[PDB]
Symmetry: C2
Subunit: 157 residues, 2 copies
Amino acid sequence: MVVAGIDPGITHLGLGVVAVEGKGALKARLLHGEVVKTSPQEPAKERVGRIHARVLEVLHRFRPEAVAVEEAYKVGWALGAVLVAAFEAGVPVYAYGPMQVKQALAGHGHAAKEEVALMVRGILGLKEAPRPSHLANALAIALTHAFYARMGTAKPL
Amino acid sequence: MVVAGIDPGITHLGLGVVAVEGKGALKARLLHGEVVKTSPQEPAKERVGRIHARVLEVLHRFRPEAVAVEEAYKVGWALGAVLVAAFEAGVPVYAYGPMQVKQALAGHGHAAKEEVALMVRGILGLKEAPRPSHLANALAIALTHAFYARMGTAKPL
């Protein structure tokens, strides 16, 4: 299955797409990874508009079965743009918090972020852990969703 | 040696950094690759300003010995922003055209782009050819510079 994962951020918005294998231990391939980077000088509408345009472009190009997002006002803006794109692309949205990601990929709710990042590197077969953290997070969220999707406990926002 | 390569583009600006080995056949590692993507709706000053901010951030973080750029008005704007960043970072700029890139990496001036992209994938040890083309181009330009730098025919803009 093909999944877009998104990590709504301060000045970076992690956006990744993975294709996960249907059998065997959780295994996926990286199809796309980007970070939407915003500047202090550019106005709010451009920052949010670009996020929208990037997410919509990714959904249309990669046609994932699902969008997965990690879990305040301004972060809410970014997620707003993301939600609009998923609505226009006709793609269902699922939300997961830090603890669920840790549980799915590291096997305990209180695992360190480094443990999650090690598993994402493992599952995707990467040479190094995917940088930066917003991208690593977005891939983890994507893989978290695939994990719960397999066992049928996907959490739809 | 560490080299930033840049491919000034229509709506995408390829920006990559490679570290090249000092002995043996041309061999490098990818340190960074990004594409600055601009939208039709965002004003010109934001498009050019972001390019500036991204390039400057990359130069400051990665401290390359050189910036290499591929070789009209609006493309000129992007390169303008790039030039400003290199000036502020104190990094020398070298320019190369399509034919020199083809010559350095494929061994003939009239090689197809696919041949250049195959060599960039080879030299950087990548699984797949680096996508998208603006990023592939920026890495090729970077590696082209390192090639001529080795043999002492670097072309400083």
